Design a protein around this ligand. Structure first.
Ligand SMILES: CCCOc1ccc(OC)c(F)c1C(=O)c1ccc(C(=O)N[C@@H]2CNC[C@H]2NC(=O)c2ccc3[nH]ncc3c2)cc1
Length: 335
């Protein structure tokens, strides 16, 4: 890419290769999940430098058969250099835990901001969707499906730019091949996943349409009391849903083109690929070059006092549970 950008990536690589776990102190929690959590950590030698550290329990990964998913998360996320994807700088490992040292984005999870605001305006949603589109353009060009798009997986940096996190379901898929794991939130799964027909990158465009709908109204378009009713609603299709009047004509047209039943008919999957999404009328006048250059003013400007401020995140219970058993199976050799 840019020669200066490349030299910076190489220097960064050399800098993190020198680091050890004992160089860091823990500041606070940014998130929690099934078998781990994300902590804000601070470098002892430079108080200005804070990071996000995902800490996962190895035995639980083994018990849930998530080994290849986590390996893929490291590979995909560590090799990605996109301004719209949180960086994974490196990993650590011991007998009990895996440790993923990531770029810190202190503006908050989009899900909590959506919750507190109820819904996002058209122009606000367009900015966040464009951030996803750019992340998708980068991933899809390298044959990588992401599969976990939803508001909890978009983080804002201190400027208000949005970035993808949580690549545990992201996967490299070959030309003309399909993958078969049933993963993801019931509200976001494409019909080809529900029907166990195999899915490919086209499932990501489906999920983009779901995201637009949820950001604009506060809720995904297909939702039922239980997962089974939700799946049937999804099978009925996006044309059977009565779009609220708050969704602008152009947004609704783009949502329905993203959420085509046939994966081959979905926008982003046609002749011009992702360009067909970016050139859609809903993005008319949107300055993509300024988005990529960081010139554009985000819709919501977060307040971040310092590199240790976690005020834009919910409170999270401390994990004071007895440590998990040692895992020496060795699937984590590369970590
Ligand atoms: C029994 C089923 C288990 O569920 C899984 C199923 C599969 C799997 O992998 C295949 C799993 F790991 C799991 C997990 O156990 C799991 C453990 C923790 C988390 C988690 O904390 N998520 C955060 C909260 N919400 C978004 C995330 N935020 C960041 O990640 C982040 C990253 C960098 C950042 N920089 N700045 C801010 C910032 C934020 C998620 C899932």
């Amino acid at each position: 890419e840019d020669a200066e950008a490349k030299a910076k990536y190489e220097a960064e690589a050399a800098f993190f290769a020198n680091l050890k776990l004992s160089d860091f102190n823990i500041i606070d929690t940014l998130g929690v999940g099934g078998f781990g959590r994300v902590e804000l950590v601070q470098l002892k030698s430079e108080e200005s430098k804070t990071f996000a550290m995902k800490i996962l329990k190895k035995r639980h990964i083994v018990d849930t058969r998530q080994q290849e998913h986590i390996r893929s998360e490291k590979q995909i996320m560590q090799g990605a250099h996109s301004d719209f994807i949180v960086r994974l700088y490196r990993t650590f490992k011991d007998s009990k835990y895996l440790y993923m040292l990531m770029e810190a984005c202190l503006g908050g999870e989009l899900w909590t901001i959506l919750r507190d605001r109820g819904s996002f305006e058209d122009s606000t949603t367009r900015f966040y969707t464009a951030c996803v589109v750019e992340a998708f353009a980068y991933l899809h060009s390298k044959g990588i499906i992401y599969r976990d798009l939803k508001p909890e997986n978009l983080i804002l940096d201190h400027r208000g730019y949005a970035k993808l996190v949580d690549f545990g379901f992201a996967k490299k898929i070959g030309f003309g091949k399909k993958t078969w794991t049933f993963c993801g939130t019931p509200e976001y799964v494409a019909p080809e996943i529900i029907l166990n027909k195999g899915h490919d990158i086209s499932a990501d465009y489906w999920s983009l349409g779901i995201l637009m709908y949820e950001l604009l109204t506060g809720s995904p378009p297909f939702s039922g009391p239980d997962p089974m009713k939700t799946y049937n609603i999804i099978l009925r299709g996006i044309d059977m849903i009565e779009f609220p009047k708050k969704i602008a004509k152009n947004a609704a047209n783009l949502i329905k083109k993203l959420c085509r039943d046939n994966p081959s008919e979905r926008l982003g999957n046609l002749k011009n690929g992702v360009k067909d999404i970016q050139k859609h009328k809903w993005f008319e006048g949107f300055n993509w070059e300024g988005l990529r250059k960081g010139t554009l003013t985000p819709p919501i400007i977060p307040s971040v006092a310092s590199p240790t401020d976690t005020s834009n995140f919910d409170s999270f219970p401390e994990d004071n549970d007895e440590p998990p058993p040692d895992d020496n199976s060795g699937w984590d050799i590369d970590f």
